Coordinates of C-alpha atoms in Angstrom, one line a residue:
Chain A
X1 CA -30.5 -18.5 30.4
X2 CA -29.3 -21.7 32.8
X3 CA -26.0 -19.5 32.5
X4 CA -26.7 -16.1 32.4
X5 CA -27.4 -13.2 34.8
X6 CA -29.9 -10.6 33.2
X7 CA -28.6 -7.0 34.3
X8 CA -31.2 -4.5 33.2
X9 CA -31.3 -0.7 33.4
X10 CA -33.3 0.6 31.2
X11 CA -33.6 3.8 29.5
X12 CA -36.3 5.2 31.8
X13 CA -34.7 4.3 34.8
X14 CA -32.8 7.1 37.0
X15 CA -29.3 7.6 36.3
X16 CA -27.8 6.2 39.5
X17 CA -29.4 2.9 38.5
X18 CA -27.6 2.9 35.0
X19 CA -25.0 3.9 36.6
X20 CA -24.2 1.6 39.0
X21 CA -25.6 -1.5 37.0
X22 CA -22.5 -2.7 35.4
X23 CA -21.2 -2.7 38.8
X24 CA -24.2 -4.5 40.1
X25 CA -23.2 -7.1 37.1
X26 CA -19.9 -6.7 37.9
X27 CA -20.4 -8.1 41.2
X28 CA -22.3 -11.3 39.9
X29 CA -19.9 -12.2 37.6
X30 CA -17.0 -11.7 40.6
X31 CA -18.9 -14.8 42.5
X32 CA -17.5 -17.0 39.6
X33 CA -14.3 -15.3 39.2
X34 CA -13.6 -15.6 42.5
X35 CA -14.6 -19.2 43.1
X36 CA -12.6 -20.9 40.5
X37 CA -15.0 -20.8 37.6
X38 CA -15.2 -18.5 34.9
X39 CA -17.4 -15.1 34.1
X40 CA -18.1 -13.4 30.7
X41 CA -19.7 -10.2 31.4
X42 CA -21.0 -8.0 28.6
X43 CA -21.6 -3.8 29.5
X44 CA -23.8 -3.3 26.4
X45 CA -23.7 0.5 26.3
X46 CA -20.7 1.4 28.6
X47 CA -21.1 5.1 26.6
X48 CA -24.6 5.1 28.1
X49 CA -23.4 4.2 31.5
X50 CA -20.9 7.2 30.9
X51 CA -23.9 9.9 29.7
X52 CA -25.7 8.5 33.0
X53 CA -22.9 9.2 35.2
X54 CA -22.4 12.9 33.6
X55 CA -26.1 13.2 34.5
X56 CA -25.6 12.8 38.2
X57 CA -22.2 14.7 38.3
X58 CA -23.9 18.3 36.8
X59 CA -26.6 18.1 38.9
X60 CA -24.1 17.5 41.5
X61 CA -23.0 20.9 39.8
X62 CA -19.3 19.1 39.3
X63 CA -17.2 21.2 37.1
X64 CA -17.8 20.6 32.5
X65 CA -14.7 18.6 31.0
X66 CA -13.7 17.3 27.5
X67 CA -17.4 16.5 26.3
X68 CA -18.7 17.9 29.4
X69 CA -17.6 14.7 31.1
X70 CA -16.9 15.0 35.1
X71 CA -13.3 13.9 34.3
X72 CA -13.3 11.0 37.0
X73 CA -15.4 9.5 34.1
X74 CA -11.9 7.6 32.9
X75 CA -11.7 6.0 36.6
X76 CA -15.7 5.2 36.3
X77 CA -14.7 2.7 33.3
X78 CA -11.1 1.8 34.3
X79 CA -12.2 0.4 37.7
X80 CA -15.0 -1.5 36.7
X81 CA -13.2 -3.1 33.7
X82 CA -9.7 -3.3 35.8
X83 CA -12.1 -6.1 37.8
X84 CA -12.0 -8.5 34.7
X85 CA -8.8 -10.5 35.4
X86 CA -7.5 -14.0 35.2
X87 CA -6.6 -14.6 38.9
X88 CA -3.6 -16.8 39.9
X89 CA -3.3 -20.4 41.3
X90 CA -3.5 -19.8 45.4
X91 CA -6.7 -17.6 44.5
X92 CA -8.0 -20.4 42.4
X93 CA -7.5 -19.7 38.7
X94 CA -10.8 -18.0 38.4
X95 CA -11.4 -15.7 35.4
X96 CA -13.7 -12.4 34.2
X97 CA -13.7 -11.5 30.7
X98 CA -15.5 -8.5 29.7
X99 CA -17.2 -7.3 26.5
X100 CA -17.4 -3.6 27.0
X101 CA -19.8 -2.1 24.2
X102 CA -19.0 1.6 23.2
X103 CA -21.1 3.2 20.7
X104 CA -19.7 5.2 18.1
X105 CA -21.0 8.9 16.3
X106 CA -20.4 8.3 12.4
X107 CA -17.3 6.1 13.0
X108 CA -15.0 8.7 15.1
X109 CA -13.4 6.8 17.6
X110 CA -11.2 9.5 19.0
X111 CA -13.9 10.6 21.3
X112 CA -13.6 11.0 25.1
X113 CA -15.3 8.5 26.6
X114 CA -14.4 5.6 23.5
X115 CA -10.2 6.6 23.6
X116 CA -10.8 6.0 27.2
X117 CA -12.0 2.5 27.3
X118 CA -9.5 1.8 24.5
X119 CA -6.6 2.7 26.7
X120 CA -8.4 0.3 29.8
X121 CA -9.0 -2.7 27.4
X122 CA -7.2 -5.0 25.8
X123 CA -7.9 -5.2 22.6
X124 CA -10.5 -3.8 20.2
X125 CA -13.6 -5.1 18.2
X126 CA -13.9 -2.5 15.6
X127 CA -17.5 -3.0 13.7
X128 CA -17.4 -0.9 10.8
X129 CA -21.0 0.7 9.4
X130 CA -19.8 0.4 5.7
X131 CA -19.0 -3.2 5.8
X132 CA -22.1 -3.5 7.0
X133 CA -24.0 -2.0 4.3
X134 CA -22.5 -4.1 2.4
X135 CA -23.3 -7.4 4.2
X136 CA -20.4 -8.6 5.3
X137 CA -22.0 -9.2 8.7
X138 CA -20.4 -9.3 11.2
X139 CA -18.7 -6.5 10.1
X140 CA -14.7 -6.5 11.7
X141 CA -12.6 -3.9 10.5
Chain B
X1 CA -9.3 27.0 14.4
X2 CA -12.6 26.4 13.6
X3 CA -12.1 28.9 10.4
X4 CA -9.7 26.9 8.9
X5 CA -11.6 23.8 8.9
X6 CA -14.4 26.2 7.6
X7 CA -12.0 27.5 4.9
X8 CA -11.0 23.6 3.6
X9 CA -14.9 23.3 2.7
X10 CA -14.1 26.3 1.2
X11 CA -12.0 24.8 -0.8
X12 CA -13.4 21.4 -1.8
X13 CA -17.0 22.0 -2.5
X14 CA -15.6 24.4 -5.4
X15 CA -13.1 22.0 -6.6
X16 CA -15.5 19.1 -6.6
X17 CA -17.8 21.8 -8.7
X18 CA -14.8 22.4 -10.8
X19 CA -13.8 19.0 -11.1
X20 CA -17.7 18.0 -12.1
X21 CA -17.7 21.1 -14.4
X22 CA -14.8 19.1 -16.3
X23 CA -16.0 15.5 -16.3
X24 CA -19.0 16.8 -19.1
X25 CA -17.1 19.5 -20.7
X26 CA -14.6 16.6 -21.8
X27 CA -17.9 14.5 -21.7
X28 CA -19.5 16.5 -24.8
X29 CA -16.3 17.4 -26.2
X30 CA -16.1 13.3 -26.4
X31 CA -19.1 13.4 -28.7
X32 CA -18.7 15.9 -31.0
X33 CA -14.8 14.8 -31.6
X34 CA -16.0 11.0 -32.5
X35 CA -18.1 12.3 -35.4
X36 CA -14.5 13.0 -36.5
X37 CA -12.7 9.8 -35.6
X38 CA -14.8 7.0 -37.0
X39 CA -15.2 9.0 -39.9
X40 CA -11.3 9.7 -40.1
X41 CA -10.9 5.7 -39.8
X42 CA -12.0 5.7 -43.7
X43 CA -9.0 6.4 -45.4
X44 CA -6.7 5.0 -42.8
X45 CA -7.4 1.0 -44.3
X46 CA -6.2 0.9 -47.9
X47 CA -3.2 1.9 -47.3
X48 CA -3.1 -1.0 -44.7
X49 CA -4.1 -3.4 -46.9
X50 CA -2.0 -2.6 -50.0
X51 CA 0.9 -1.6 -48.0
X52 CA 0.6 -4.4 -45.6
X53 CA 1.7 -4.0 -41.7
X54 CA 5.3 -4.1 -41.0
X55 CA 6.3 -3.1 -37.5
X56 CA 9.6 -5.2 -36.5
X57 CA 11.4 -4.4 -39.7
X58 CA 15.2 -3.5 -39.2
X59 CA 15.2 -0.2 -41.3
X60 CA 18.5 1.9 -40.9
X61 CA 16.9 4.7 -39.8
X62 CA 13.8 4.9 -38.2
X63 CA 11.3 8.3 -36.8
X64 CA 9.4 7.5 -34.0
X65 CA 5.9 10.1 -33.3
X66 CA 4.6 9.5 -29.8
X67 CA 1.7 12.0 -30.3
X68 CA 0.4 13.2 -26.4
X69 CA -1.8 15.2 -25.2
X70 CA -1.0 19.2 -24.8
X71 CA -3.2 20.1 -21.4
X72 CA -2.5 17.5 -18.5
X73 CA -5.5 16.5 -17.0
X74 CA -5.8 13.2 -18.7
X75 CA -4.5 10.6 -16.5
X76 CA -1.8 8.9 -17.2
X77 CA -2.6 8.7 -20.8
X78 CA 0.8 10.6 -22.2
X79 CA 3.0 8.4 -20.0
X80 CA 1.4 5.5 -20.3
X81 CA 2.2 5.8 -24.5
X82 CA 5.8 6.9 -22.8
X83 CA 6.5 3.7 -21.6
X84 CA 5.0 1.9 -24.5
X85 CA 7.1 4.1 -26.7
X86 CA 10.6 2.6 -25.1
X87 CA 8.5 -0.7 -25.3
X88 CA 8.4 0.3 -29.2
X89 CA 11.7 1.7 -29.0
X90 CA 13.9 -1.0 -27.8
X91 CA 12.2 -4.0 -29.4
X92 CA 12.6 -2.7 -33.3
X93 CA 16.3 -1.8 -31.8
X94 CA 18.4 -4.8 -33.3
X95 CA 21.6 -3.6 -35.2
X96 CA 22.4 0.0 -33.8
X97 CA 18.9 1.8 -35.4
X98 CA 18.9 5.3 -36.1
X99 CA 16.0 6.9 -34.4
X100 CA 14.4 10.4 -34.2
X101 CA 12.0 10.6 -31.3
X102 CA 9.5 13.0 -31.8
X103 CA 6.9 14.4 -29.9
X104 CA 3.2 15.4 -31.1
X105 CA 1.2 17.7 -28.2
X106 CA 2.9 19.4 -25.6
X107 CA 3.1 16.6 -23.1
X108 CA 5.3 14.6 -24.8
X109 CA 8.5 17.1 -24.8
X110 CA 8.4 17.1 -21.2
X111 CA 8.2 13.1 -20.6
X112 CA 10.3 12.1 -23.4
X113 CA 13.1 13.9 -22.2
X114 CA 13.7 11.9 -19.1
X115 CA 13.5 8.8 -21.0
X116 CA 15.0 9.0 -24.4
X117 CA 16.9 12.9 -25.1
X118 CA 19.6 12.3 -27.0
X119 CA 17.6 10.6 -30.0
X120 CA 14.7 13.1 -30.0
X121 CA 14.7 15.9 -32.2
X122 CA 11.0 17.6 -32.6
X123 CA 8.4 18.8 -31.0
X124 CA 5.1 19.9 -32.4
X125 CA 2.5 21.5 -30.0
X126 CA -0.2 23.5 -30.1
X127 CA -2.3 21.2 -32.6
X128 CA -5.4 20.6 -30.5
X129 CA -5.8 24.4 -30.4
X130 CA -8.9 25.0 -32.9
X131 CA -9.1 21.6 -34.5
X132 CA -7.2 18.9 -35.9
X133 CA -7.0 19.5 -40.0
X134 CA -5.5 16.9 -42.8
X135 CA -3.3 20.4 -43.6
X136 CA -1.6 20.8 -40.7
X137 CA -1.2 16.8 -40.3
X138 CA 0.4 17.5 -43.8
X139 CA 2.7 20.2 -42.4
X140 CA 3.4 17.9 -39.3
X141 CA 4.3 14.9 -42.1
X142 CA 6.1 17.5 -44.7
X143 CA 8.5 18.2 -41.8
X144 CA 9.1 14.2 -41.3
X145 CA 10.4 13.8 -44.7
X146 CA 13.0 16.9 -44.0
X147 CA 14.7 13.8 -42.8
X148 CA 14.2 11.2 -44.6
X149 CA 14.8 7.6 -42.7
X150 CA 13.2 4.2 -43.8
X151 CA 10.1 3.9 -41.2
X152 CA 8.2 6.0 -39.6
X153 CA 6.6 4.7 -36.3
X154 CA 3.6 6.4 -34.1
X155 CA 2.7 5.5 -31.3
X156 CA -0.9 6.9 -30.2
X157 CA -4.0 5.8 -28.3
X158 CA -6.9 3.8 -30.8
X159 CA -9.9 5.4 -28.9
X160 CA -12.1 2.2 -28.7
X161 CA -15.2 3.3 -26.3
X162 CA -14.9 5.6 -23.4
X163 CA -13.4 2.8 -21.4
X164 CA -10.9 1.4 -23.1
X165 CA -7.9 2.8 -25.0
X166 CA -5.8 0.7 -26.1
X167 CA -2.1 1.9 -27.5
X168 CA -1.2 1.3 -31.0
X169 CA 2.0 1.3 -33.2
X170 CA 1.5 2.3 -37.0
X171 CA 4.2 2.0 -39.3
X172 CA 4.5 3.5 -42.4
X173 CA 8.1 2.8 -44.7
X174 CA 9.6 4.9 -46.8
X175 CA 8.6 4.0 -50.8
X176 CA 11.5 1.7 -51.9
X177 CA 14.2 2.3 -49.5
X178 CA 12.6 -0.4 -47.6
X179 CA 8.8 -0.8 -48.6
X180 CA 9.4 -3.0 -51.5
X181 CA 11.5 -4.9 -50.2
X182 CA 9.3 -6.2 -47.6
X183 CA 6.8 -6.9 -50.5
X184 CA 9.3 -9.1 -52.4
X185 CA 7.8 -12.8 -52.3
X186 CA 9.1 -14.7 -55.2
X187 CA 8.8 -12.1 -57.3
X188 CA 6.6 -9.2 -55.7
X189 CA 3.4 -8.8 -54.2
X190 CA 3.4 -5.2 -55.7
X191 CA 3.5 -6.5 -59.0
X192 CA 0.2 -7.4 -59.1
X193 CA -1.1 -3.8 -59.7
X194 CA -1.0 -2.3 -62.8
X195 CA 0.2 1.9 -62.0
X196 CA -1.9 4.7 -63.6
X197 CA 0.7 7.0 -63.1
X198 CA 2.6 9.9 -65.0
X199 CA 5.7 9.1 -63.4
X200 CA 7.3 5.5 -62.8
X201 CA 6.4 2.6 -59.9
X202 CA 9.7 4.6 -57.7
X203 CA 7.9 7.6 -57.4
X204 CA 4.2 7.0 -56.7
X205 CA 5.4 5.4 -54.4
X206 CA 7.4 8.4 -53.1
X207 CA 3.6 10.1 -53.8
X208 CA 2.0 7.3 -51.9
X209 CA 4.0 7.0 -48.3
X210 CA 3.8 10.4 -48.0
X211 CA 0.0 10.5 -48.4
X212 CA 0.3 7.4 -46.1
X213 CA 2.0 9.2 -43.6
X214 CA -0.4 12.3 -43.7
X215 CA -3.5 9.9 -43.6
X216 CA -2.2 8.0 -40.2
X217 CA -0.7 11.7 -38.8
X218 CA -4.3 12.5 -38.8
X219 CA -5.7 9.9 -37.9
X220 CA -3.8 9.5 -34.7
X221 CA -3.8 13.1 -33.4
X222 CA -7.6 12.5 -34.1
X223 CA -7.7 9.4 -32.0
X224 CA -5.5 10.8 -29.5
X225 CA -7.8 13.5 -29.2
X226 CA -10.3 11.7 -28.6
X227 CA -8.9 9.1 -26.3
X228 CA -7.8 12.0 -24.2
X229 CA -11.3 13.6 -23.4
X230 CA -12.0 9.9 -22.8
X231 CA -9.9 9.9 -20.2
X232 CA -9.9 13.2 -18.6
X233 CA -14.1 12.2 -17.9
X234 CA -12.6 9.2 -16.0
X235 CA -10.1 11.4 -14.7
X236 CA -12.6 14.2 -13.3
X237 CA -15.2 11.5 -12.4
X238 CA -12.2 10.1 -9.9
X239 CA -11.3 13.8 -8.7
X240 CA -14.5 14.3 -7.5
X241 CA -15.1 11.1 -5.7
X242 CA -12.2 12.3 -4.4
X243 CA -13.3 15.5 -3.4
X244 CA -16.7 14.1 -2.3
X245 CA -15.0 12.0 0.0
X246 CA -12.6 14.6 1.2
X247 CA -15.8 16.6 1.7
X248 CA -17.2 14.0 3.6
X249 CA -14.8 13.5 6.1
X250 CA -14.3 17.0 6.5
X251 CA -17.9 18.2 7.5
X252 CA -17.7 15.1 10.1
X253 CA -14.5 16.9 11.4
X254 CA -16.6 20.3 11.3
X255 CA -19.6 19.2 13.1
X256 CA -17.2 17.7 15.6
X257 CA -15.6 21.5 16.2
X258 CA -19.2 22.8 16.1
X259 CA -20.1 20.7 18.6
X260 CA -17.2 21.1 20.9
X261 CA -16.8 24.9 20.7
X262 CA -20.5 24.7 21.8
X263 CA -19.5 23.0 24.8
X264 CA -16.3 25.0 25.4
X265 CA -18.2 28.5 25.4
X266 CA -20.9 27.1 27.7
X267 CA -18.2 25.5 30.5
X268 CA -16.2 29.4 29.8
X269 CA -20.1 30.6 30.7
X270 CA -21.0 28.7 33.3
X271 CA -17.6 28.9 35.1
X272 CA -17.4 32.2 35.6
X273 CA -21.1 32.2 37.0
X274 CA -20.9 29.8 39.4
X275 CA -17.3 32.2 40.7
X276 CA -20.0 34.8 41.5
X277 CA -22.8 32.9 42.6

């Protein structure tokens, strides 16, 4: 905890507070990037950020998409995760590295909101639920 | 769209009912075929032990019996005796051999053929029909001495358990074109028995290959048999795994359309409320 900001939205909060708290947390961990030192920032349940943001765009009455998704739901991941970057030498070297969490419905990743955090991210983590069954924890695919 | 993916569970959940009704019909027919076999593996013995075992012997002509399967379900049990047949088939070949391939069950004409044609010459099918008899394993051994060559090889599957089959050569020589000759050890190791016969020691013998030709015939269209309800329950226990799985993955894809066809007809609803209002 000497280390680590404590982000907290919880499931009974409103939906604009979900929503905006990985940019809230976001904004902490840009302090370090931006001073030379290093972030690690963690959006545990970026799916849940998305179902909070769909909350607030249909009773906004915004037209449904995909998954009944307001469609600017791609640009409500890709800017927040487009902040995690390894700056250059005049800006000080600083660094962000994010752990997006997306959760999963019986292992089909070609859902909306998870193909679209796979095409802002880097590189996968792919936790598969029968390796896990199995114990081989933690379970990589 | 959503009726064809509807249509493919159609299609699997019969199959994998199909493929289940199959796993215990060749489950019992299993059963009630080894109270055949281990009785059948009576008589097959003394001939092995007065006749001896003599597979790599360089006979001048030779008739190889790969006995298969006639319905194809089985899983790779009449090729895999294929291969072991040119396994069989190229080893005993030393000098330039003589060999007529032959093929026992109905499987074995069509697998043979790509492998070995121009030596094969018979085909008997149709044997696992009603039930496997010592008469018609005499007919299928009467028409083996219509030629009339110095072995006689078969190559079948020894059902062991319902696991494991293991392949087996059994060799049978013709009474004194070659058979005594292999028994010649400073002296003979035939001479030991006094022969009961009407007839001389040249023909009982000639009685006696022939009897031990029918006896393994049987036996290894009775093993066979055997090993090949043996291996169609592993067969249909892996076809409907693999229509379990196919199922599986299927009603995930189905549940998926559900879902979105839901939410397709509610924006279509929705849409053209909101135009009006």
């Amino acid at each position: 905890m000497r280390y680590t900001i404590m982000v907290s939205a919880t499931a009974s909060d409103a939906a604009p507070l979900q929503f905006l708290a990985p940019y809230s947390g976001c904004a902490m961990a840009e302090y370090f990037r931006d001073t030379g030192k290093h972030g690690l920032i963690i959006y545990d349940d970026l799916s849940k950020q998305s179902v909070a943001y769909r909350q607030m765009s249909l009773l906004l009455r915004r037209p449904p998409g995909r998954e009944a998704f307001p469609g600017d739901v791609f640009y409500l991941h890709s800017r927040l995760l487009e902040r995690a970057a390894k700056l250059s030498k005049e800006l000080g070297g600083g660094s962000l590295t994010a752990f997006p969490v997306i959760e999963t419905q019986a292992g089909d990743v070609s859902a909306y909101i998870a193909t679209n955090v796979i095409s802002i991210t880097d590189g996968q983590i792919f936790l598969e639920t029968e390796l896990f069954y199995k114990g081989i924890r933690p379970a990589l695919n | 769209s959503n009726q064809a993916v509807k249509q493919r569970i159609r299609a699997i959940k019969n199959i994998g009912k199909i493929t289940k009704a199959m796993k215990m019909v060749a489950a019992s027919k299993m059963k009630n075929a080894q109270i055949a076999v281990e009785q059948s593996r009576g008589l097959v013995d003394p001939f092995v032990r007065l006749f001896g075992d003599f597979p790599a012997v360089n006979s001048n002509k030779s008739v190889v019996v790969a006995v298969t399967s006639d319905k194809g379900l089985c899983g790779g049990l009449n090729s895999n005796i294929t291969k072991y047949t040119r396994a069989t088939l190229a080893t005993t070949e030393s000098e330039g051999k003589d060999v007529v391939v032959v093929s026992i069950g109905d499987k074995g004409r069509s697998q043979l053929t790509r492998i070995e044609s121009q030596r094969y010459q018979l085909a008997i099918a149709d044997t696992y029909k009603v039930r496997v008899t010592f008469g018609q394993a005499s007919l299928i051994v009467e028409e083996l001495i219509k030629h009339n060559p110095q072995s006689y090889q078969i190559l079948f599957n020894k059902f062991r358990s319902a696991i494991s089959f293991k392949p087996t050569v059994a060799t049978i020589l013709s009474p004194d074109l070659l058979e005594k000759q292999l028994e010649d050890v400073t002296g003979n190791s035939l001479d030991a028995y006094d022969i009961e016969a009407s007839h001389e020691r040249s023909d009982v013998l000639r009685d006696l290959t022939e009897f031990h030709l029918g006896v393994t015939l049987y036996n290894a269209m009775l093993e066979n048999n055997c090993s090949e309800h043996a291996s169609r329950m592993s067969a249909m226990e892996n076809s409907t795994k693999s229509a379990g799985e196919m199922l599986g993955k299927l009603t995930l894809d189905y549940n998926r359309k559900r879902q979105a066809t839901i939410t397709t007809e509610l924006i279509e609803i929705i849409a053209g409320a909101s135009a009006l209002m």
